[PDB]
């Protein structure tokens, strides 16, 4: 197993941060450090005040290096908020003693891993997130994996995917520090938070196969995630957005839901919010899971509507039915407004696919896509108007299964 090479395993256990690898490294906690009492059992750090938060992990004895050759791998889940593209320099995870060791930091849209041999010798490698795809900041959970071979390459992975590979030329060896300090420290040239969970160190070079297994094993893939990677929940306000139309928010005109262009990318707080409601499922713990039957409520002008099918003023195309906001009872929601959810995560986003349910069962009649169509809504009368609407393709939709126009994300309102 790959756990045979695991020399450190920082985990929250019984509301206490500790090493669970077996090597029993000392873990001291100081300042404002908040531990999550539920999964993923993360710990939260800040960057403001003298009491900001500090986790000192002192590796107990030399034992830990007893099975090491010239390779080691670091892996951890991490979330940063608000990770703006013009963020100033911050060292976040430091393990450098006497100008030797390694250090992880963040600056602008870069997460940089620096490997130090001495004063004069260091090599770094980074992941830079796509600014155009994250205009509101890269504020989502992501899985870092960093592998290093002194006689080979220095590699970095994000969400199981290889981002960059640099050959180790300048560095001959590394005398590692026995201390690792998790603390957000501003580099000498608005406040940000950082969540971390399952910080592992391995005494070997993990390959792509092992990194993807590790990536998936640390997740509950059946549990659908919100836009930031947290567990999607019932009975909670979200902004429902389509992957292909991130600069659109949800609005209403007559029976129909319509998508309008948002004002800016400061945040997603614009338009009407949805609330997800459970109908069927194997578990009942508030979390939304794959194959759950559900429906959507939305409050508009102090009245709640449910998302459901309606007849458009004229036909939009073969096997297409538009999704509108309707004030109707549960029997009608079960017939014409119930959906079977299915998680759909990619490197770029945590999303989902929604299939039209037959009588609130797991039987599928169609898939929820998006598109612009010319017809009449609300007080329209004289002319037809192009409306970007959510639309269900029924019966025949195998080609839409692979389309990103069926990928829906949920941004929490909070």
């Amino acid at each position: 197993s790959i756990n045979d090479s695991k020399i450190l395993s920082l985990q929250n256990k019984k509301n206490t941060l500790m090493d669970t690898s077996g090597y029993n490294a000392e873990v001291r906690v100081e300042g404002n450090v908040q531990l999550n009492p539920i999964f993923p059992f993360d710990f939260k750090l800040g960057s403001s005040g003298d009491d900001r938060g500090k986790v000192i992990v002192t590796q107990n004895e030399n034992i830990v290096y007893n099975a090491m050759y010239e390779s080691f791998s670091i892996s951890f889940w991490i979330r940063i908020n608000k990770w703006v593209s013009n963020l100033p320099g911050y060292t976040i995870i430091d393990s450098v003693k006497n100008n030797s060791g390694w250090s992880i930091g963040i600056i602008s849209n870069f997460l940089v891993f620096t490997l130090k041999q001495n004063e004069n010798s260091e090599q770094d490698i980074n992941f830079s997130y796509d600014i155009s795809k994250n205009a509101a900041g890269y504020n989502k959970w992501f899985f870092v994996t960093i592998t290093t071979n002194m006689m080979g390459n220095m590699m970095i992975y994000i969400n199981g995917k290889l981002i960059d590979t640099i050959k180790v030329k300048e560095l001959t060896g590394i005398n590692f520090s026995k201390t690792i300090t998790f603390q957000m420290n501003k580099i000498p040239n608005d406040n940000i938070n950082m969540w971390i969970r399952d910080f592992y160190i391995f005494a070997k070079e993990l390959d792509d196969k092992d990194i993807n297994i590790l990536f998936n094993s640390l997740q509950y893939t059946n549990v659908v995630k919100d836009y930031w990677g947290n567990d999607l929940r019932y009975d909670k306000e979200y902004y429902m957005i389509n992957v292909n139309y991130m600069n659109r928010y949800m609005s209403k005109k007559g029976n129909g839901i319509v998508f309008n262009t948002r004002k800016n990318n400061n945040d997603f707080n614009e338009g009407y919010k949805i609330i997800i409601k459970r109908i069927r499922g194997n578990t009942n713990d508030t979390r939304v899971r794959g194959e759950n039957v559900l429906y959507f409520n939305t409050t508009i002008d102090n009245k709640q509507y449910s998302l459901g099918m309606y007849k458009p003023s004229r036909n939009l195309g073969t096997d297409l039915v538009p999704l509108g906001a309707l004030d109707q009872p549960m029997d009608e929601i079960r017939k014409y407004g119930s959906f079977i959810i299915q998680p759909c995560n990619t490197f770029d986003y945590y999303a989902s696919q929604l299939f039209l349910s037959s009588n609130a069962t797991t039987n599928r009649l169609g898939i929820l896509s998006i598109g612009s169509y010319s017809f009449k809504l609300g007080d329209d009368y004289w002319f037809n108007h192009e409306y970007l609407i959510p639309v269900i393709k029924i019966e025949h939709y195998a080609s839409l299964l692979e389309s990103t126009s069926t990928h829906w994300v949920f941004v929490p309102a909070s």
Partner: peptide, 15 residues
């Protein structure tokens, strides 16, 4: 299931 599709077409599509 085939009756479900014809029912939806009957209700939500124009004639």
């Amino acid at each position: 299931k085939e009756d479900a599709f014809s029912k939806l077409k009957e209700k939500f599509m124009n004639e």
